[PDB]
Design a protein around this ligand. Structure first.
Ligand SMILES: [Ca+2]
Ligand SMILES: [Ca+2]
Ligand SMILES: [Ca+2]
Ligand SMILES: [Ca+2]
Ligand SMILES: [Cl-]
Lengths: 107, 114, 108
């Protein structure tokens, strides 16, 4: 999947998490988000199409995707413990961090 | 030897997944693969022994191992849902990707000058 | 968020694992450790404040954190199979790794 596909998967699974009723649906959605965040870190967003992958700018992009994976993993740990509303709050919060990355690198 | 060892762990656990009878057996094998994929991205394969770790070619290698981690994680999501046949099919697909990475970065010395 | 805050989360959750009685307690703590290791790889520790983020020294730091995430994930696989004592022994090994990394990268 290209970068925009991975971002769509993040968007689609955030919507699943906010409507979820039990931990298993929240964890499954977070695992799909984690896979997408890892994939996004290996892809090239539009704003970086012609940049050297070892540039400071490309590294900052990949680190930003790694930050998303950290937050997704923390929300997975909350949900694993049965703290489903807490994991849902964490997902709502990391929606804004995902959005920051999306807006920075899209188009 | 670290990269070759990780690749062996990937191949070993793909066989576990093919023989698995339930979701928990598949998930455990995928978690071992994910650990080996992450470890492999910190290793230097034979093809890159002489290159700067900050070179483009070394980064491309690391991102290729991260691609494998993403496929493994997706298979793990399928197995967590109970979609065992689907996770097994995803694993058969990532075997092809593991093979491609292995052929790209392994030592080619047996093939020199053929 | 601090590199130091991620190191504290790793330290805290190693104590949780050492006192655990069952696999789910170990798995939850390992997942918090995995989140912290990933987060730490995106931070700049004091030792690296004077270096380019694209330097070999910064890359070695990030790969040391990735190495820690691999060990954490392997301990999670052990605990997922019910091998609680094995997972706790793996955690004792990564205590050493976390300590070494802390000592290396703290202080400018
Ligand atoms: Ca597409
Ligand atoms: Ca069988
Ligand atoms: Ca503190
Ligand atoms: Ca403290
Ligand atoms: Cl076999």
């Amino acid at each position: 999947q290209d970068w925009e596909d991975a971002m769509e998967t993040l968007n689609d699974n955030l919507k699943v998490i906010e409507k979820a009723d039990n931990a298993d649906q929240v964890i499954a959605a977070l695992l799909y988000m984690l896979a997408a965040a890892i994939a996004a870190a290996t892809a090239t967003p539009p704003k970086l199409e012609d940049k050297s992958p070892t540039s400071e700018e490309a590294l900052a992009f990949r680190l930003g995707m790694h930050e998303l994976a950290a937050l997704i993993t923390k929300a997975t740990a909350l949900a694993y413990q049965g703290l489903v509303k807490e994991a849902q709050a964490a997902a709502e919060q990391l929606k804004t961090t995902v959005n920051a990355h999306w807006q920075k690198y899209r188009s």
